[PDB]
Write a protein that binds this ligand. Structure first.
Ligand code: SAM
Length: 327
């Protein structure tokens, strides 16, 4: 989490949908915006949320009437990707029913926020030979919004982890915003080796194996790439060893293998899995954030979340365009 100097969104209100851990909340709250509504149905997630923020997000969203959602200026939603059963009139609003995205849209159509802010996985722009994107695009256009989207990788914004995701930023057409742009990349200076806790606190994550094979020499200088040092078992998902002097591999919420959701790292002669705290850090989160007591849920929650840093940079640029209005 990089801390922002110029608080561009002071005064502007927002809502937290599919809140999860509340990554969007931390990101916009660092730019001065204030939260007025939160929604998330996962029991284990609402718990870690009220632990930090003090409120229990509201329950199941498809049961919430849109006329009961507070006036707000920005709508945040890191929603789950689903295929659409669209054999209808080209693309559009109605062709959304049955999806979770539909809930976003039904809320936009009635509350008209100035901006709509979303994110999804890297292979979203190509899902179903192009028609998943198309639909989200044509639905926004119908509700009278501009549509900007680009794929960014977290190793380009100060976080050492390979991780491409798609960010979508929409502005109502009546605000006439034709100068917005995505953040520029910068050289990386923090590496996995810098995020580790002292060995004492991670002994119980060490995993010994006799079928361990070292394919490469250990790296001496830091690099902005993932460096594979060995294999365990067959050499597939969850059975690869990476260097602590390169970048961390993509955290996953539901991966398998011996080194399950975090991958395995060579740290001081032994091979271990990352701890939840070294996980928060690789996602951008700050040490003041109280993590969930169960290591299993925490790996799920973190692999599903957002890289804080990248969101902060875009939140700043949003405030920018909105705040530039000369005579
Ligand atoms: C990809 S993620 C959360 C990402 C969020 N940026 C965060 O930082 O964790 C999707 C979220 O959708 C929530 N969710 C799925 N279906 C829901 C529903 N019907 N009502 C409320 N929350 C729902 C999931 O539980 C998960 O918390």
């Amino acid at each position: 989490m990089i801390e922002i100097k110029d608080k561009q969104l002071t005064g502007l209100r927002f809502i937290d949908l599919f809140a999860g851990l509340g990554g969007f909340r931390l990101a916009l709250e660092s730019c001065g915006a204030e939260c007025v509504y939160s929604n998330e149905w996962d029991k284990y997630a609402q718990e870690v949320y009220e632990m930090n923020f003090g409120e229990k997000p509201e329950g199941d969203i498809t049961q919430v009437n849109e006329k009961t959602i507070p006036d707000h200026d920005i709508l945040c939603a890191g929603f789950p990707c689903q295929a659409f059963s669209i054999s209808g009139k080209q693309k559009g609003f109605e062709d959304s029913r049955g999806t979770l995205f539909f809930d976003i849209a039904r809320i936009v159509r009635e509350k008209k926020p100035k901006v709509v802010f979303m994110e999804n996985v890297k292979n979203f722009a190509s899902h179903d030979n192009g028609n998943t994107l198309e639909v989200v695009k044509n639905t926004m256009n119908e509700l009278d919004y501009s549509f900007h989207a680009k794929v960014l990788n977290a190793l380009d914004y100060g976080i050492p982890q390979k991780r491409e995701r798609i960010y979508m930023i929409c502005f109502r057409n009546d605000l006439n915003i034709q100068n917005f742009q995505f953040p520029k990349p910068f050289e990386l200076n923090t590496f996995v080796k810098d995020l580790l806790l002292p060995d004492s606190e991670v002994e119980h994550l060490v995993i010994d194996r006799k079928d361990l094979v070292m394919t490469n020499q250990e790296i001496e200088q830091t690099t902005p790439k993932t460096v594979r040092l060995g294999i365990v078992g067959k050499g597939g998902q969850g059975e690869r060893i990476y260097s602590t002097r390169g970048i961390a591999i993509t955290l996953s919420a539901y991966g398998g293998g011996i080194f399950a959701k975090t991958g395995g790292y060579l740290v001081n002669g032994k091979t271990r899995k990352l701890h939840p705290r070294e996980c928060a850090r690789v996602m951008g989160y700050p040490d003041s954030y109280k993590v969930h007591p169960s290591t299993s849920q925490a790996y799920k929650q973190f692999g599903n979340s957002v890289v804080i840093n990248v969101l902060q940079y875009i939140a700043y640029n949003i405030g920018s365009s909105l705040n530039f209005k000369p005579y």
